[PDB]
C-alpha cells in the first residue's frame, strides 16, 4: 500500500513519526510572526517548521523548545516572490539569501530537541536534479540530533517571459526516480506541492512514482515531505498517494471546519459566536486549527488500521481518487 | 477596508493566549464529559472494585507465623492496576510495608528474605515472586498483593530506592506514608488513582522518562495541597502535569522549605535532567488541554494506550 | 422587519434593485484585473463595481457596457494599506484626480458614484456629508452614494483609537436627515464594528434612523462584505448592497466560503486543467452570488425558508440585534 | 512555492472564457433538463393545443390569405399581437386604421360571435380568439407594428414566405420560440424598443443555418445570442440589402441598436447562467 507509517530514524528507533502535519511559521505575509509563535506555543506540543531566512533576519526569536521537533526550512520560500497554492494575496520583496547566510544559520543551530535541516534553494540558484543531490549532501551537515532532508526544485531558472516552460515550473520526476538510489544519503525527500504537478491528479501520480521508486531501493520507511500542502482535502489525498510530511501556512490564513478549509470570518460566525471579542478571534482560529491538524493527523494514522472509516470527511472522494490514481 | 487586524491588537500575545485558553476551560460539553467519565471509570475499574478487605486479611494471614517479617504501621492497600499498567515503582503501588529488623546486607537481601519465607509459608496457597522493588503474592483468584520490603535501623525505617535498587532511599517512610494517605483521604481517595493514571500516561511515552515513582508521588502531594478544582480524574490528572512541569525544575521540599530527599537523583535546580522532564510533562499537559478543548475522546484514549 | 426591498430610484421608479450582491474588481492584489474583467464579462449580467483609482492609472480598460450598472468606487481602497476582513495577504490619489475621473465618466448604463476617501484625508462626520454633497456631481443617469469613514487619521503607534478604526455611528444617526441629499449610504464592514454582533446592531441603528426620516427605501452599502454568511446577516440587520473581492480569492460552496483548491477537488474534479480553474471559480462564484441574492430577495416573501444554508444561525442573530433596538 | 498562478496561465482571457463555457455547455443534468422541458410545455400548452383546424374553418365560415398562417395563440401568458407570428390570417380589402375599423363591423354581420378591434389585429372571440390582420391592395401593404397610422413598408409576400417556410424548416418551432422571446422581453423593466416585425425578422436570420436541437429550451437562447449581434446592423436577407423593418433603429451601430443589443445580451447571459447553475426558478422568472 502507498500509505505507511514512516519517519526519521536514529539507530533504528523512530524519532519523528509520520504521517505528520507540520504547522509552519514564516515572515512572508505575516509581519507579526513572532507574536504568533509566542501565542501558539502554549498549544503546540508536536513538531513545527521555521525558516532559516527568518532566523537570519530576526523575524523570529524563539524560544523554540516548546515543540517536539523543529524543521529548519532553508529559506527558499521567503527568498521567493513565488507562492504556494494556498496563498490568497501578497503585497513580498525578498532580501538577499546567499548560501553562506544559510550555512551560518544551520551551522550554529543548537537545540535540545530533534532538528530536521532542509537543503538550500533559491529561485535564481537552480541545478540539474542529480547536482541538487550532490549539493544537499555537501551543505547539510551530518551532525548529532540533526536529520537531513533534500527539497527537490526545478532545474531551470525563470526566463522572465510571458510564459514559463515546465523546466521552470515543475521538478523532473523522471530524474528523481533515476537517481532514487542516492536518497539513502538523506533522511527525507522533499517536493513542493505546486511544482510536483499541475493539478491534483498529476500531483498524486508523481508522488506515487517517487514512493514506488523509494520502496524499490529499500527505502520503504523514508518520508516524503510535500511543502505547502496543509489543508483538509489535498493533504489526506497526498498521504494516500505515498507522502508522509505536510506543512503550510494555511492554518494561519484559513479555518479548518467540518472537512473544509474556509474563510475565517465565516468560521467565527458559525462556530465561535457573533459576539466573540475581536482581539481573540485570530488566536482562537490558530489554536483550533492546530488541534484540527492533530485530529486530521490521527485520521491518517488510523487509516492504516481502520481503513477509510478513519476519515471523518470526504470519504467517497478519498476512495475514488485512491482507486483512479493507483 | 479599515485600520485593524493585527494578531494581538497591541496586546501581549501570551495574555491573548491566556484569555482564549481561560474561555475554553470554562465551557464544557456534557456529551464529551460523559464519554470522558466513562473512560476513567473503566481505567479505574479494577482499582475501585478491588476486594480490599480480602487484601487485609491475606496480609495478616501471610505474616502471622514469621517473626522476622512484620506489617507496617500506616494502612496503604494502594495496590491494584489502573489503565492496564502492571508496574510497582512507589508507595502508591504497594499494599503494605513489610518491616524486617536484621541493613548492611542491602535492600535485595531483605526482599529475597521476605520472598523466601513467604513462598515456603504460602506454598500451595499463593505464588510469591520478587520484583524490581516489591514482592508480589499472587493467589488463585488472581489477586496480587504488593509488599514493599523495609528494614528497621537506629535511624528509623528505610524503604528501597526506586532507581538505585542496591541501596536504601533517603526518604522517611513515616512522613511519606502519612502525606500520601492524608492527602488521598482529604482528596476523596482520588489522589492515588490520579498518580497511577499519570504514571500510566508517562509509560506510554516513547521518550526516556527519568522520574521515579517516589518523586511522582511527591510531585502530586505538592500539586494537590492547594487544589480547588473538581474532584474528578478528568480535572485532577491535567493539574498534576501542569503543576509538575514547573515543580520538577526545583528540588522537592515540604511546606516549610525542608528537603524530603526524593529529588536528589535529578541533580541541582534547573539542571538538564529537570528541563528534559519539564518538557515531557509539559507536552502531556498540552495534549490533555488540546484533547479536552477539541472534545477528542480518541486523543484522550491514546494518552493511556 | 429590518429587511426590505430597496434600491436606487429615478422619478419613483426602481432603477437598481436591492438586495444586490456586487462583484468587485480591483488592482490591489490582482495585477491582471483587466484580464479578469474581460473573462467574467461573458457571465456578468448584473451590476459590478470598479475603482476610479484603477481608471486613472489604467489598471482597468473595459469596455464596461456588459454590466447592468456600474458602481464607481472612489479609490479609497486602492489608496490604502488598510484591508478588509476578507483579505488574506499605494500611489498618490488626490481629490482632483478623483474629480476628473468621475467628471469625464460616460456610460450608457446607470452609474453610482461613491464619495471620495483617503486614509490621510478624513473629516468629522458632518464634514464628510458636506464634502460628498459638493464633490459628487448632480447629473442625469448618475446616482450619488456617500461612504462614511472614520473621523481621525491613524496615529502610527502600536494601537489605534476607535476614532481611527470605527465610523461614528452616533454622528451618522444624528445627521441622518442630511441623507436625503444622497441616493445611498455606505459603510465599510471592518469600520462599522469590531465583531459580527456589533456590525449588525450598528447597521440596524442606521436603518432605524433612516426609517425615521422616511428614507425607508434608501440602500445601505456594506463595502467589503461579500460571502455566504456575513452578507445575509447584514441584510437581515438592515443592509442592502454588498460588494467585495472575496469572489476572486475564494470559492462559494454549500453555504461556505472555502479554499479554491479544495473546491476544485470536491466539485470541479481532480483532473481539471489548471489554466481553467481560476476562471471557472469566478464564473461559478458569480452564479452563486445570484442564487444567494435570490435567496435574500425571497426572504421578504417566504421567510427563512428562502435560505438553503445556515438557517439556525441567521435566525438567532437576527433576533438578538432586533430586540436590542 | 513555484512559478505560476496567472489568471489565464498566459492565455487570452476570452479564450479561457470560451474553454470554460464550452465545457459547461457540453455536460448536462437529466433532472434539470426535464424540469425545463416541463416548464416550456406548459408555457406552450395553449399554442400547441390550439384547434387550428377549427380556426381555419371558422375563418372560412366567416369569409382568407394566400399563405396559410394560423400563427395566432397565446404563449407564456402573453396576450399581445404585434407581428405575423401572432396572427391567424391577413384579411385583404380591395381598393390603415380605416381598414381595421371596416373589417371589424363586417364580421359582426356574418355572425352575432364577438368582434373586437385592437392596436394591430381584429380579434374574433367565440367561447377561442382568432387574430386577423387587415390589409389593402396598391403588391400588398400591411399595417406598421409601431405607429397606428402607417404601413410597415415591408413586402408582406416576402415576410410570409420566410416565416412559414422557416417555421416549417424548424418543425413548427420558430413561431413558438419568437412568442417566448417576446414574453421574455416584455418582462424586462427596461423600455422594449424592437417591433414585432423586426423581432420575427431577427429570428428568421437567427435560425437560418441552425443545426442545434429543435426544442424551445435550446432555440430560445440561440435567438438572443444571435440577435445581440444582428440588431447592430440593418436587417437584410442573403442577396437583398433592405427589408424595411429596422430603419427606425437608425444607422448601423447606433445608440438605439446598442441599447437593444445590451438588453438582448443580458437575456442571453441570464439564460446561459440559469442553465449552467441548473436553476429552474431563474428560468421561471424570465417568463414572469
Ligand atoms: S484532593 C484536592 C483537594 N485538596 C486537598 O488537599 C483537600 C483538603 N486538604 C487540605 O487542606 C490539605 O491537603 C492539608 C490537609 C492541609 C495537607 O496539609 P498539611 O499541613 O496537613 O500537610 P503537609 O503536607 O504540609 O505536611 C505533612 C507532611 O507531609 C510531608 N510532605 C509534604 N510535602 C511532601 C512531598 N512533596 N513529598 C513527600 N512528603 C511531603 C512532610 O514531610 C510533612 O511531614 P512533616 O513532619 O510536617 O515534615
Ligand atoms: S430552425 C432550423 C432549420 N433552419 C435552417 O436554416 C435549416 C435549413 N433548411 C431550410 O429549408 C431553411 O428554411 C433554409 C434553406 C435556410 C431556407 O432558406 P431560403 O432559401 O428559404 O431563404 P432566403 O432568405 O434565401 O430566401 C427566402 C425568402 O424569404 C423571404 N425572406 C428571407 N429572409 C427574410 C426576412 N428576414 N424577413 C422577411 N422575409 C424574408 C424572401 O422572400 C426570401 O427570398 P429572398 O431571395 O431572400 O428575397
> Which site among C190, C198, C243 would you substitute to test the B interface, given the most B Cβ atoms closer than 10 Å to its Cβ?
C190
**Do C286 and A125 contact (CB within 8 A), yes or no?**
no
Task: Provide the 10 A C-beta neighbour count for residue B156.
Answer: 12
Could you tell me the distance, in angstroms and rounded to a whole number, from the CA of residue B179 to the centre of ligand 1?
A: 5
Could you tell me the distance, in angstroms and rounded to a whole number, from the CA of residue B254 to the centre of ligand 1?
A: 8
**Do B157 and B148 contact (CB within 8 A), yes or no?**
no
Nearest alpha carbon, ligand 2 atom 9 = D169
Cell reading at D132: 386577423
Which SS3 state, helix, strand or coil, does residue D132 take? strand
Ligand 1 contacts CB of residue B218 (under 6 A)? yes
Q: Do chains A and C touch (3 or more CB pairs under 8 A)?
A: yes
* Among candidate residues C82, C84, C149, the one with its CA nearest the CA of residue C117: C149
Cell reading at B83: 489503565
**Do A21 and A244 contact (CB within 8 A), yes or no?**
no
| CB within 8 Å: B1 and C83 | yes
* Among candidate residues A72, A3, A48, A18, the one with its CA nearest the CA of residue A297: A18
Residues 6 or more apart in contact with residue A286 via CB below 8 angstroms: A36, A39, A40, A251, A252
Is residue C258 within a helix (H) or strand (E), and if so which, with residue range?
Answer: strand C256-258
* Among candidate residues B279, B231, B232, B273, the one with its CA nearest the CA of residue B251: B273
Count of A-C CB contacts under 8 Å: 119
Query: How many residues does this entry show for chain A?
Result: 326
Could you tell me the distance, in angstroms and rounded to a whole number, from the CA of residue D169 to the centre of ligand 2?
A: 9
Cell reading at B170: 533517603
Beta bridge partners of A116: A71, A147
| CB < 8 Å to A232, chain C | 262
Q: Give me the numbers of helices (H) and strands (E) for chain A, helices first please.
A: 12, 12
Q: Give me the numbers of helices (H) and strands (E) for chain C, helices first please.
A: 12, 12
Residues 6 or more apart in contact with residue C310 via CB below 8 angstroms: A270, C228, C229, C232, C255
DSSP string of A52-66, one letter each residue: HHHHHHTS-----TT
* Residue pointed to by grid coordinates 491494584: B80
CA of residue C254 relative to chain centroid, distance: 22
Could you tell me the distance, in angstroms and rounded to a whole number, from the CA of residue D210 to the centre of ligand 2?
A: 12
| CB < 8 Å to D8, chain A | none
Task: Report the residue from A200, A263, A278 with minimal CB separation from C270.
Answer: A200
Enumerate the H helices of chain C as residue ranges: 33-40, 52-57, 95-104, 125-135, 162-165, 169-174, 196-212, 230-237, 246-249, 260-263, 277-302, 311-323
**Do C302 and A273 contact (CB within 8 A), yes or no?**
no
Q: At what angle do helices D255-276 and C277-302 cross, to 10 degrees?
A: 90
Instruction: Write down the experimental method used for this entry.
Output: X-ray
Enumerate the H helices of D2-149 as residue ranges: 13-26, 30-43, 45-48, 52-62, 97-110
The residue to mutate among B225, B228, B251, having the most atoms of ligand 1 within 8 angstroms of its beta carbon, is B225
- Dist CA B94 CA C118 (whole Å): 76
Burial D102-137 (b: 16+ CB within 10 A, else e): ebbeebeeeeebebebeebbbbbeeeebbbbbbbbe
Q: Chain C closest CA to B287's CA: distance in Å?
A: 28
**Do C182 and C137 contact (CB within 8 A), yes or no?**
no
| CB within 8 Å: D7 and C283 | no
Beta bridge partners of A226: A191, A246
* Among candidate residues D184, D197, D207, the one with its CA nearest the CA of residue D249: D197
CA of residue B189 relative to chain centroid, distance: 13
- Dist CA D127 CA D115 (whole Å): 12
The DSSP secondary-structure symbol of C186 reads E
Q: Is some CB atom of chain D closer than 8 A to the CB atom of C14?
A: yes
Cell reading at C33: 484585473
Query: Which region holds residue A29: left if phi is over 0, alpha if psi is between -120 and 50, else beta?
Result: left
- Dist CA C237 CA A274 (whole Å): 13
Atom of ligand 2 nearest to the CA of D201: 36
Query: How many residues does this entry show for chain B?
Result: 305
| CB < 8 Å to C189, chain B | 2
Domains of chain C: 7-320 (3.20.20.105)
* Among candidate residues C116, C113, C101, C100, the one with its CA nearest the CA of residue C140: C113
Euclidean distance between the first and the last CA atom of chain B, given in angstroms as a whole number: 50
Ligand nearest to the CA of D246: 2
Strands B144-152 and B135-139, sheet pairing: antiparallel
- Dist CA B252 CA C312 (whole Å): 55
Which SS3 state, helix, strand or coil, does residue B239 take? helix
Q: Do chains D and B touch (3 or more CB pairs under 8 A)?
A: no
* Residue pointed to by grid coordinates 490591489: C28
Q: Chain C closest CA to A309's CA: distance in Å?
A: 18
- Dist CA B53 CA D84 (whole Å): 108
User: Phi and psi for A59 in degrees, rounded to 5?
Assistant: -65, -30
| CB < 8 Å to A294, chain B | 290, 294, 299
* Among candidate residues D129, D140, D118, D142, the one with its CA nearest the CA of residue D58: D129
Which CA distances in Å does A159 have to A82, D12, D22? 14, 20, 32
User: Phi and psi for C57 in degrees, rounded to 5?
Assistant: -90, 5
Chains that touch B (3 or more CB pairs under 8 A): A, C
**Do B150 and B110 contact (CB within 8 A), yes or no?**
yes
Ligand 1 contacts CB of residue B179 (under 6 A)? yes
- Dist CA D105 CA D134 (whole Å): 13
Domain boundaries, chain D: 29-286
* Residue pointed to by grid coordinates 493507483: A326
Cell reading at A7: 519517519
| CB < 8 Å to A269, chain C | 196, 229-230, 233, 313
Residues 6 or more apart in contact with residue D84 via CB below 8 angstroms: D69, D71, D133, D159, D160, D163, D196, D197, D200
**Do C14 and D188 contact (CB within 8 A), yes or no?**
no
Could you tell me the distance, in angstroms and rounded to a whole number, from the CA of residue B200 to the centre of ligand 1?
A: 24
Enumerate the H helices of C146-259 as residue ranges: 162-165, 169-174, 196-212, 230-237, 246-249
Cell reading at A315: 470519504
**Do B24 and B287 contact (CB within 8 A), yes or no?**
no
| CB < 8 Å to D270, chain C | 45
Nearest alpha carbon, ligand 1 atom 37 = B218
Which CA distances in Å does B83 have to B86, B89, C276, D260? 9, 15, 55, 80
Residues 6 or more apart in contact with residue A202 via CB below 8 angstroms: A196, C271
Beta bridge partners of B75: none
Cell reading at A145: 540530533
Is residue D229 within a helix (H) or strand (E), and if so which, with residue range?
Answer: helix D216-230
CA of residue B3 relative to chain centroid, distance: 53
Beta bridge partners of A262: A255, C258
Beta bridge partners of B151: B100, B158
Report chain D's C-alpha Rg in angstroms.
21
**Do B171 and B180 contact (CB within 8 A), yes or no?**
no
**Do C22 and C226 contact (CB within 8 A), yes or no?**
yes
Task: Provide the 10 A C-beta neighbour count for residue A198.
Answer: 19
Q: Do chains B and C touch (3 or more CB pairs under 8 A)?
A: yes
* Among candidate residues A32, A7, A22, the one with its CA nearest the CA of residue A71: A22
Task: Provide the 10 A C-beta neighbour count for residue B132.
Answer: 12
* Residue pointed to by grid coordinates 387587415: D134
- Dist CA C35 CA C39 (whole Å): 6
- Dist CA C173 CA C179 (whole Å): 10
- Dist CA D116 CA C85 (whole Å): 64
- Dist CA C125 CA C178 (whole Å): 11
Cell reading at C207: 436603518
What's the resolution in A?
2.4
Beta bridge partners of D211: none
* Among candidate residues A209, A202, A142, the one with its CA nearest the CA of residue A177: A209
Residues 6 or more apart in contact with residue C270 via CB below 8 angstroms: A199, A200, A201, A204, A237, A321, A324, C264
- Dist CA C93 CA C59 (whole Å): 14
Q: Give me the numbers of helices (H) and strands (E) for chain D, helices first please.
A: 11, 5
Cell reading at A207: 508522488
Cell reading at D178: 419568437
Residues 6 or more apart in contact with residue D254 via CB below 8 angstroms: none
Residue in chain D nearest A196 by alpha carbon? D2
**Do C22 and C223 contact (CB within 8 A), yes or no?**
no
CA of residue C73 relative to chain centroid, distance: 9
Cell reading at B6: 493585527
| CB within 8 Å: A287 and B23 | no
Q: Is some CB atom of chain D closer than 8 A to the CB atom of C217?
A: no
Beta bridge partners of A21: A246
Is residue D281 within a helix (H) or strand (E), and if so which, with residue range?
Answer: helix D280-286
**Do B173 and B151 contact (CB within 8 A), yes or no?**
no
Pseudo-torsion of CA A217, A221, A225, A226, nearest 10°?
A: 80
Burial B204-218 (b: 16+ CB within 10 A, else e): eeeeebebbbbbbbb
Q: Chain B closest CA to C31's CA: distance in Å?
A: 19
Q: Is some CB atom of chain D closer than 8 A to the CB atom of C107?
A: no
- Dist CA C282 CA C289 (whole Å): 10
The DSSP secondary-structure symbol of C115 reads P
DSSP string of B126-171, one letter each residue: EEEEE-SSSEEEEETTS-EEEEEEEEE-SS-EEPBPSSS-SSB-SS
Amino acid at each position: 500500500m502507498l500509505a505507511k507509517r514512516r519517519g526519521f530514524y536514529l539507530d533504528g528507533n523512530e524519532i519523528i513519526r509520520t504521517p505528520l502535519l507540520l504547522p509552519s511559521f514564516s515572515s512572508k505575509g505575516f509581519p507579526e510572526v513572532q507574536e504568533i509563535i509566542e501565542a501558539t506555543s502554549d498549544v503546540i506540543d508536536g513538531p513545527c517548521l521555521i525558516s532559516a531566512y527568518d532566523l537570519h533576519y530576526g523575524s523570529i526569536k524563539g524560544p523554540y523548545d516548546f515543540a517536539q521537533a523543529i524543521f529548519i526550512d532553508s529559506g527558499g520560500y521567503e527568498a521567493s516572490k513565488d507562492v504556494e497554492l494556498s496563498d490568497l494575496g501578497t503585497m513580498h520583496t525578498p532580501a538577499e539569501w546567499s548560501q553562506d547566510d544559510f550555512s551560518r544559520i544551520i551551522g550554529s543551530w543548537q537545540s535540545p530537541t530533534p532538528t530536521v535541516l532542509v537543503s538550500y534553494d533559491h529561485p535564481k540558484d537552480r541545478l540539474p536534479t542529480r547536482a541538487q543531490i550532490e549539493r544537499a549532501d555537501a551543505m547539510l551537515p551530518k551532525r548529532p540530533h540533526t536529520f537531513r532532508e533534500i527539497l527537490f526544485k526545478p532545474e531551470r531558472v525563470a526566463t522572465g517571459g510571458t510564459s514559463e516552460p515546465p523546466e521552470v515550473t515543475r521538478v523532473n520526476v523522471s530524474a528523481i526516480v533515476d537517481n532514487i538510489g542516492m536518497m539513502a544519503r538523506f533522511d527525507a525527500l522533499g517536493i513542493t506541492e505546486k511544482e510536483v504537478g499541475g493539478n491534483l491528479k498529476e500531483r498524486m501520480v508523481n508522488i506515487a512514482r517517487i514512493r514506488r521508486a523509494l520502496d524499490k531501493v529499500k527505502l520503504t520507511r523514508m518520508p516524503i515531505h510535500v511543502f505547502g500542502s496543509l489543508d483538509t482535502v489535498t493533504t489526506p489525498l497526498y498521504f494516500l498517494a505515498g507522502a508522509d510530511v505536510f506543512d503550510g501556512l494555511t492554518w494561519l490564513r484559513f479555518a479548518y471546519y467540518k472537512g473544509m478549509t474556509i474563510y475565517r470570518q465565516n468560521y467565527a460566525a458559525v462556530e465561535l459566536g457573533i459576539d466573540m471579542k475581536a482581539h481573540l478571534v485570530d488566536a482562537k482560529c490558530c489554536f483550533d486549527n492546530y488541534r484540527y491538524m492533530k485530529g486530521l493527523e490521527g485520521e491518517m494514522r488510523g487509516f492504516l488500521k481502520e481503513g477509510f472509516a478513519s476519515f471523518e470527511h470526504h470519504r467517497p472522494l478519498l476512495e475514488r481518487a485512491c482507486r483512479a490514481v493507483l | 477596508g479599515g485600520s485593524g487586524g493585527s494578531f494581538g491588537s497591541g496586546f501581549d500575545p501570551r495574555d491573548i493566549s491566556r484569555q482564549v485558553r481561560d474561555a475554553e476551560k470554562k465551557l464544557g460539553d456534557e456529551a464529551f464529559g460523559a464519554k470522558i467519565a466513562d473512560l476513567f471509570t473503566g481505567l479505574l475499574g479494577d482499582y475501585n472494585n478491588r476486594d480490599t478487605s480480602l487484601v487485609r486479611q491475606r496480609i495478616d494471614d501471610m505474616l502471622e507465623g514469621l517473626r522476622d517479617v512484620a506489617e507496617g504501621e500506616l494502612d496503604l492497600v494502594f495496590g491494584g492496576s489502573v489503565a492496564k499498567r502492571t508496574y510497582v515503582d512507589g508507595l502508591s503501588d504497594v499494599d503494605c510495608l513489610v518491616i524486617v529488623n536484621d541493613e548492611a546486607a542491602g535492600p535485595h537481601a531483605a526482599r529475597d528474605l521476605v520472598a523466601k519465607e513467604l513462598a515456603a509459608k504460602l506454598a500451595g496457597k499463593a505464588e510469591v515472586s520478587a520484583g524490581k522493588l516489591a514482592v508480589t503474592v499472587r493467589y488463585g483468584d488472581g489477586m496480587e498483593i504488593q509488599l514493599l520490603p523495609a528494614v528497621r535501623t537506629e535511624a528509623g525505617v528505610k524503604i528501597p530506592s526506586a532507581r538505585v535498587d542496591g541501596r536504601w532511599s533517603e526518604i522517611d517512610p513515616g512522613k511519606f506514608q502519612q502525606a500520601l494517605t492524608k492527602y488521598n483521604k482529604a482528596c476523596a481517595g482520588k489522589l492515588v488513582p490520579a498518580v497511577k493514571l499519570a504514571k500510566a500516561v508517562i509509560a506510554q511515552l516513547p521518550d526516556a522518562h527519568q522520574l521515579s515513582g517516589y518523586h511522582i508521588e511527591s510531585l502530586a502531594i505538592d500539586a494537590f495541597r492547594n487544589y480547588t478544582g473538581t474532584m474528578t480524574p478528568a480535572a485532577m490528572l491535567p493539574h498534576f502535569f501542569e503543576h509538575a512541569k514547573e515543580r520538577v525544575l526545583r528540588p522537592m521540599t515540604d511546606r516549610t522549605g525542608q528537603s524530603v530527599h526524593v529529588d536528589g537523583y535529578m541533580g541541582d535546580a534547573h539542571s538538564d535532567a529537570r528541563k528534559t522532564a519539564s518538557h515531557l510533562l509539559g507536552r502531556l499537559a498540552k495534549r490533555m488541554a488540546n484533547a479536552t478543548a477539541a472534545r477528542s475522546l480518541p486523543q484522550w484514549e491514546d494518552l493511556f494506550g
